[PDB]
Design a protein around this ligand. Structure first.
Ligand SMILES: [Cl-]
Length: 111
């Protein structure tokens, strides 16, 4: 469910997103289109992503289950974490380089 590299990454959400923006631009733009079509859920999505990136490798491994079983966000916008979790190619290229991007750069959420 959650790729092994996302379990392991020491990057934060904005470093990862900026890395995807650069290394898989089509996936980033499609995610942002989807994000901006769910405006009511944007902050929730951001808080979730922050929360996930605060967990340890082992804890994120533990989360894999609870993620699967869904939360409000998962039934309201299935693809809310799609950029983070769904394609192992995108995830590999993002997690390769994201440590070179600026932590906390919230403009990556703002398309
Ligand atoms: Cl919405």
């Amino acid at each position: 469910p959650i790729p092994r590299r996302m379990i392991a990454t020491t990057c934060d959400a904005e470093q990862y997103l900026a890395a995807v923006r650069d290394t898989s631009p089509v996936y980033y733009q499609r995610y942002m289109i989807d994000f901006n079509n769910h405006a009511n859920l944007q902050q929730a999505t951001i808080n979730k992503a922050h929360w996930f990136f605060s967990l340890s490798p082992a804890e994120r491994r533990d989360y894999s289950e609870h993620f699967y079983n869904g939360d409000p966000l998962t039934f309201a916008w299935v693809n809310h974490m799609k950029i983070f979790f769904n394609n192992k190619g995108v995830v590999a290229k993002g997690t390769e380089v994201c440590n070179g991007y600026p932590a906390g750069d919230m403009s990556v959420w703002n398309w």
